[PDB]
Design a protein around this ligand. Structure first.
Ligand code: GDP
Lengths: 280, 151, 95, 67
């Protein structure tokens, strides 16, 4: 599942790649940037194997600059991308939206959606669905957008959802995330809505864990962080680069008993995750 | 304060089996030896005769044993039970309870006048009376930990 | 060949549902810990009685002293000698 | 001597050797058998002579062949 990053020059693809992936199917592989300038596309210039090897195509649109020509070039790209392979998920990111109001952001997203839909109607493409995400480097939005893009390329999503739901239901967990060690891209969660504040807490917990481990090296990552109100934050490294982060509430119980039952349940969950080849 | 190395060595020494010479009666070693608290049942120190999964299983068993012991410590009805062996050493009274855990013989004894517990677990072939004598003589040598409370 | 992949996906769905059910069956709640009932008080005589119950009158009739008196005391001494555990040092250290 | 059984007033086994290692269920019946001042007893059952000695509240059951 190799995703391809496409966009105009100075839209922010390299900065996005650096911020996300520098700080296979599921691991954060070396993605491919592609500077696409305005030109006439050559018909079948040995690009069929390239687009057939892309799990999902990601397009970047700069909201600061004019984007009508960007949407036109995007439509030209989709015009052969959907023709070569009709199973490619197409994603569009509206980057650099940090200095915009909520109403302006929603209006811009609606205008971009309407323009893309009308241009695809003009080109005669049918049965194609394009997702849109409002992304920015300075906040959590790019992480959530890449999380959705990665989640669209894991065929075992619902089974992981059921497994995490059962784990949370039998361990008094508030919210459990199945992160990855790099890029902080959470892979699976429960049916509960992804709270932004809790996601940022878990991401900074991942950063603190990795940094503190890297400070003392050269002699399986586990971490328990308990707050003042009894709320604990748990960490346990899963198979390959996956890591499990959960927020467990005590509900007026013993701390050590809760830690023991959570450790046993999470070890059982890891043993179950060993059978499924969701890693790497 | 406390010292983990000396308590670990003490538990490793209490994992020693019995080999009688006048009567040929070989006994196996204990399955696990550990010290747990009297409030939450968590493992303070532990030692095994023979990795993380076994530690978690031992913690779960310690929690189960403390949960069963908590109701027995607060019950005064049916006090003349055949599985209770209350011994008084150095004018300190305690109660010892023996339990059966499927195929494992688990015996626990509270360290007298303190918030600590001493637990010995062996296999199903191990006799209960030898466990009682073992844990009594172990509590005889633990006079320095008497009167210790959690901070 | 795609129908063989459809059968493979059906086997994948059955296997993954079995994997979910297998890891779902080992979930222990704190209610299961508190009311387990596994830890029961067991004596040697009661264990022997349960063994005979699963396997399946006054037998004894009422009618040397030196040898038995020696051997009982020697057995008790041998039991008490091996139970003497010497610490490798002090247990609690001061400041 | 065929085997030995060591049990206290509670009857729990401290040691079980010989035939008595597979003859555990008779402790409940033997708990009602009277002794002498010295603690010795010679009680016969199942064509075997059982010798008892109670010292410090522990009764040692020793099996010997009747024949
Ligand atoms: N404010 C803001 N600026 C961004 C963001 N992403 C990229 N930029 C700007 O884009 C510039 C870098 O663009 P770059 O990644 O090199 O473009 P590319 O090489 O075509 O992919 C930087 O000067 C940033 O200021 C963003 O999310 N927010």
């Amino acid at each position: 599942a190799m995703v391809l990053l496409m966009g105009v020059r100075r839209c922010g693809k390299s900065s996005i790649c650096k911020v996300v992936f520098h700080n296979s199917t599921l691991i954060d592989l070396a993605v491919m940037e592609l500077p696409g300038q305005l030109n006439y596309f050559e018909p079948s210039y040995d690009s069929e194997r390239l687009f057939k090897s892309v799990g999902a195509l990601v397009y970047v649109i700069d909201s600061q600059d004019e984007y009508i020509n960007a949407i036109t070039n995007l439509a030209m790209i989709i015009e052969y991308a959907y023709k070569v392979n009709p199973s490619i998920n197409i994603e569009v990111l509206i980057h650099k939206v940090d200095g915009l109001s909520e109403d302006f952001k929603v209006d811009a997203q609606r205008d971009i959606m309407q323009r893309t839909g009308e241009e695809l109607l003009e080109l005669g493409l049918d049965g194609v669905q394009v997702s849109f995400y409002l992304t920015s480097i300075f906040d959590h939005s790019i992480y959530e957008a890449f999380s959705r893009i990665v989640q669209k390329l894991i065929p075992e999503l619902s089974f992981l959802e059921n497994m995490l739901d059962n784990l949370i239901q039998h361990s008094k967990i508030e919210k459990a995330f199945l992160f990855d060690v790099n890029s902080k891209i959470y892979v699976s969660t429960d049916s509960n809505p992804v709270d932004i504040q809790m996601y940022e807490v878990c991401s900074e917990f991942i950063d603190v864990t990795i940094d503190l481990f890297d400070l003392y090296k050269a002699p399986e990552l586990q971490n328990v962080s308990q707050l003042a109100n009894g709320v604990i934050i748990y960490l346990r490294q899963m198979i390959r680069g996956l890591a499990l982060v959960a927020i467990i509430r005590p509900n007026g119980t013993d701390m050590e008993s809760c830690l023991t039952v959570a450790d046993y349940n999470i070890d059982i969950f890891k043993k179950g995750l060993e059978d499924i080849w969701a890693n790497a | 304060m406390l010292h983990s190395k000396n308590v670990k060595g003490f538990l490793e020494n209490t994992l020693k089996p019995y080999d009688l010479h006048s009567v040929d009666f070989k006994t196996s070693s204990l399955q696990s030896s550990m010290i747990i608290t009297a409030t939450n049942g968590g493992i303070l120190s532990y030692a095994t005769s023979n990795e993380i999964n076994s530690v978690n299983n031992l913690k779960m068993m310690s929690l189960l044993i403390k949960d069963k012991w908590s109701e027995d410590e607060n019950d005064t009805e049916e006090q003349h039970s055949n599985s209770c062996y209350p011994v008084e050493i150095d004018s300190f009274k305690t109660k010892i309870y023996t339990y059966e855990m499927e195929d494992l013989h688990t015996c626990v004894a509270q360290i007298p006048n303190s918030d600590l517990l001493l637990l010995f677990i062996a296999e199903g072939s191990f006799p209960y009376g030898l466990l009682v004598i073992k844990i009594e003589r172990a509590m005889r040598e633990l006079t320095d930990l008497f009167g210790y409370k959690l901070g | 060949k795609e129908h063989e992949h459809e059968q493979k996906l059906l086997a994948r769905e059955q296997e993954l549902r079995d994997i979910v059910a297998n890891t779902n069956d080992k979930l222990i709640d704190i209610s299961m810990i508190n009311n387990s009932g596994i830890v029961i008080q067991g004596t040697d005589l009661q264990e022997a009685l349960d063994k005979r119950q699963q396997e399946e009158t006054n037998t004894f009739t009422l009618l040397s002293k030196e040898q038995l008196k020696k051997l009982h005391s020697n057995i008790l001494n041998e039991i008490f000698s091996q139970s003497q555990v010497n610490k490798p040092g002090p247990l609690t250290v001061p400041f | 001597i065929k085997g030995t059984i060591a049990f206290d007033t509670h009857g729990n086994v401290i040691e079980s050797t010989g035939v008595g290692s597979q003859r555990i269920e008779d402790i409940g019946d033997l708990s009602k058998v009277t002794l002498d001042a010295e603690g010795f007893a010679q009680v016969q059952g199942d064509s075997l002579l059982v010798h008892l000695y109670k010292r410090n509240d522990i009764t040692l059951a020793v099996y010997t062949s009747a024949q």
